[PDB]
Structures are given as structure tokens and as C-alpha cells.
């Protein structure tokens, strides 16, 4: 019959879950955001649309930290994104409290995954309207991840989601080929700012504000921090240059 898309945990005749697929639609409609895995850390960047001159610049930070070594950025329904991070912080806290060691990124990834996958098991809940790029440095180096509303997630070299996810993916795939020997945190920051600028074309209507953060063993000491001041402007320039 039909109407297999009105309730959440329902399987359509061809084995799908439309409610989750509709969630993806909310994600695709969101701002573009990415993640680049350099050789001793990870870099996170995101598009902040200037809906008006009235928005205080730099004042509406999107990227979020979990614990002291993990970074999270998402596209789609912001509130849903925060909700997931709050869970992540709880999960990270619970883990550390018992095992002492701060949560390994791979462990954290499944914590988020199981949680999100949980929201596709009942009709009394709605799936998450966000795709999330996250990662950090742990006992075994750097790890970059992307989680989908379906609860699906994998490890990435480069990741992008949102409005300009195609431009981004194109650009990210290029990098991968032109750097078989890895990329540096400093270089990933620059490259990231650029990828965001290019991917801004599929939204060239409103003006935007760039935001970058990173977690590098050598640059931030395994801790997650926001790229600001001179290093930030410098990346904006490098991007503003190649965009011309």
C-alpha cells in the first residue's frame, strides 16, 4: 500500500525508512561544513551565513568541543546538533569517570552512533536532523568521522555535508590525490578555509562568516582549539586569493 512515510520506525516495502530519509533533506538544506584529517590531528571548518548585518560578527559560534580533545560540527537543524553534543559530553564524561582515560575517538564515534541509531527504532521519536563531522587525537593518532541521521558513520580522510557538500567533496578528493604523503595541520587549516569559500558558491546569495577549529598533536597538543587571529585571517586570505 502507501503511507509508509508517516511513522518513524516503519519499513517501506523496499526496506527503507522514509522518515530518516526526510531527515536527510533537512540536513542537505543546511549550511556546508567540513573536516580534514591531517597527519597529526584534524581540522574543522564551517559556513556561517550572514542573514543580516544585525548578527554580531564572530558571536554565534557553531563548532563545539566535547571533553578537551574532541571537536564537533554539523549541518541541518542546529538545535538537534546541540542536543547530540550534550549527549556526547555526558557519554564522554561517563566513560572517563570509569576508565580514567579520556574517551578514544573511535569509542566516542560509536557512542554517538548507537544513540542516533536509537532514534530510528521507535515511532515515538524523530530522527536527528543533522549530519555531524567530528574527531580528535587520542592514544592512536587522529581520527575524523561523519555521522548520518540513519546512525551510519565511518572514518574519513576528508568529509563534507550540507548545501555545498558536492563542491567540497570534489575539492577534498583533489587534496587526497595531491597529498598521498599527508597534509600538515597548518596546511589543512588553509586548505579548509578555501574549500569553504568554493563551496559557498551554491549559496553565493547571502554573505558568510568562516569558522575553523583544530586538534593537532604538534599544534595544539592534542587539545581542541579554535583558529583565530593571525592564523585565521591568513587562511581567509589564502582562500580569498585562490577564489580569484
Amino acid at each position: 500500500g502507501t503511507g509508509y512515510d508517516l511513522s518513524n520506525s516503519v519499513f517501506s516495502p523496499d526496506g527503507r525508512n522514509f522518515q530518516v530519509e526526510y531527515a536527510v533533506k533537512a540536513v542537505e538544506n543546511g549550511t556546508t561544513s567540513i573536516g580534514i584529517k591531517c597527519n597529526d590531528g584534524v581540522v574543522f571548518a564551517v559556513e556561517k551565513l550572514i542573514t543580516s548585518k544585525l548578527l554580531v560578527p564572530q558571536k554565534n559560534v557553531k563548532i563545539q568541543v566535547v571533553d578537551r580533545h574532541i571537536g564537533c560540527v554539523y549541518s541541518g537543524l542546529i538545535p538537534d546538533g546541540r542536543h547530540l553534543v550534550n549527549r556526547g559530553r555526558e557519554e564522554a564524561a561517563s566513560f572517563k569517570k570509569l576508565y580514567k582515560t579520556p574517551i578514544p575517538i573511535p569509542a566516542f564515534a560509536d557512542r554517538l552512533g548507537q544513540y542516533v541509531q536509537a532514534h530510528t527504532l521507535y515511532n515515538s521519536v524523530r530522527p536527528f536532523g543533522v549530519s555531524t563531522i567530528f574527531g580528535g587525537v587520542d592514544k592512536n593518532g587522529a581520527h575524523l568521522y561523519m555521522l548520518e541521521p540513519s546512525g551510519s558513520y565511518w572514518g574519513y580522510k576528508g568529509a563534507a555535508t550540507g548545501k555545498g557538500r558536492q563542491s567540497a567533496k570534489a575539492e577534498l578528493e583533489k587534496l587526497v590525490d595531491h597529498h598521498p604523503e599527508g597534509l600538515s595541520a597548518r596546511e589543512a587549516v588553509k586548505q579548509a578555509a578555501k574549500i569553504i569559500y568554493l563551496a559557498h558558491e551554491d549559496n553565493k546569495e547571502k554573505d558568510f562568516e568562516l569558522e575553523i577549529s583544530w586538534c593537532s598533536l604538534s599544534e595544539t597538543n592534542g587539545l581542541h582549539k579554535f583558529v583565530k587571529g593571525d592564523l585565521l585571517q591568513e587562511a581567509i586570505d589564502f582562500a580569498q586569493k585562490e577564489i580569484n
Binding site: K25, L54, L55, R126
Partner: protein
């Protein structure tokens, strides 16, 4: 179409929309206009109060949450009471436990997360009210715009409610000017009254019809009504 996906908030429309949230969002547009703007020393709220008859009163639009924080509403009056009361507790908790004034940026994050909970769980309904929050904390003066969808934003100024686009354009135009009205409250308030008047139509702002609130450096959040606002009409 829509009719099949707007029966609750636990359902996404084929295009990724949440209609129940959108309908709630509508209740705000139907509400009386209110404005918010801030310099580096103060933050101001100006709201148009609405009445039923002429034998009735004018429903209050501004609520104080603490000595350094307050807001103005547009939409379901009850919900504003609920949310503002929640904001009062959070302010109170921050003081009692940490002897710390709740940062406006934080208050915003809290509201956002509280709202979000009624948009992903069956049985709950989104809040049907918009809120403009102003406050003076350790990083200065602030202005926030809260939407029932959970989206909270920090701005220099803004307006919500019927015909609000009027004032919002004015502020978006006056920006460079009012954001510098430091050390002069009466000037910021006047800029606020001039902003809100851009959303008038029916009548003009009278004394028991206008409502203004202010918070700043050495200024505990205070509301002005009636004759108190006469000097601005």
C-alpha cells in the same frame, strides 16, 4: 500534502520540514511587535502592548529574569511565563551554587536546549512564543533572539511580531549609529522607540500602550510603563 505531516512534531515532511514547529512559529508573527537593540554600555527592549477592549488592560510584554537579565515576548503569553520562569531558575541556580551571574550567551544555550526537547519527543508541543533577551554580564551588553524552533541568536538589534520587518529594516539601517550610543540610555531608548514606530499602522504609541525596559553597566534591569515612558512619546 502538508496535512499528512503536521499532526505532531515527531514527523518530518518529505522536504525535511517540521510543520508543528512552523505553525508555532506563526503564533509569533501574529503577536504584537517588540524591538531590541544595544550599544556597548546598555541593552534596550521596547514593546507595543496590546489590549482587548478599551475596558481591558494592556497585556505586559516585558519580564525581568534577574537584576542583569530580562526579556520581551511575542506570541503565547503563558509560554513566555513558563520560559522566563525557567530562565529565572537558571539565573538563580548560577548564583546560589557558583556565586556567578549567568552569562547571557549561556542563558541562550539553555533556552535553546529546553525548547528543542519539545520538538523531537512525542506528546510535547513546541513553545508558541518568541523572546528577545537583553542583559549585561562580564562581557558587556547583549541581545538575543529566541525562536520556538530552538534557534537562539545574538544580534545588535532586532524585532519580532506583526509588521516587525519595518523596525528590523530601520535598525539594519541605523546600526552604525545606535551601537555607539554608549553612556547615554535616553538616547538608546529613543532610538528604540523610533525603531518600533516603523512597525506601527493602526495607531500611534501612547502612554499606557508603550513598554520599555533597560539594563546596563551600572543599571539593574528595569521596566518602564505609563507616565514612566511619557518622556519618550
Amino acid at each position: 500534502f502538508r496535512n499528512n505531516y503536521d499532526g505532531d512534531t515527531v514527523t518530518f515532511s518529505p522536504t525535511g520540514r517540521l510543520f508543528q514547529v512552523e505553525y508555532a512559529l506563526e503564533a509569533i508573527k501574529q503577536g504584537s511587535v517588540t524591538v531590541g537593540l544595544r550599544s556597548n554600555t546598555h541593552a534596550v527592549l521596547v514593546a507595543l502592548k496590546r489590549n482587548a477592549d478599551e475596558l481591558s488592560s494592556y497585556q505586559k510584554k516585558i519580564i525581568k529574569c534577574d537584576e542583569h537579565m530580562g526579556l520581551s515576548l511575542a506570541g503565547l503569553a503563558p509560554d513566555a511565563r513558563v520560559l522566563s520562569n525557567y530562565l529565572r531558575q537558571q539565573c538563580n541556580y548560577s548564583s546560589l551554587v557558583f556565586n556567578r551571574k549567568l552569562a547571557v550567551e549561556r542563558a541562550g544555550h539553555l533556552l535553546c536546549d529546553k525548547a528543542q526537547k519539545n520538538t523531537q519527543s512525542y506528546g510535547g508541543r513546541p513553545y508558541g512564543v518568541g523572546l528577545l533577551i537583553i542583559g549585561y554580564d562580564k562581557s558587556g551588553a547583549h541581545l538575543l533572539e529566541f525562536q520556538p524552533s530552538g534557534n537562539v541568536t545574538e544580534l545588535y538589534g532586532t524585532a519580532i511580531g506583526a509588521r516587525s520587518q519595518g523596525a528590523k529594516t530601520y535598525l539594519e539601517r541605523t546600526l552604525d549609529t545606535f551601537i555607539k550610543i554608549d553612556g547615554n540610555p535616553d538616547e538608546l531608548i529613543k532610538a528604540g522607540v523610533e525603531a518600533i514606530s516603523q512597525s506601527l499602522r493602526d495607531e500611534s504609541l501612547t502612554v499606557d500602550n508603550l513598554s520599555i525596559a533597560i539594563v546596563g553597566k551600572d543599571t539593574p534591569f528595569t521596566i518602564y510603563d505609563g507616565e514612566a515612558v511619557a518622556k519618550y512619546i
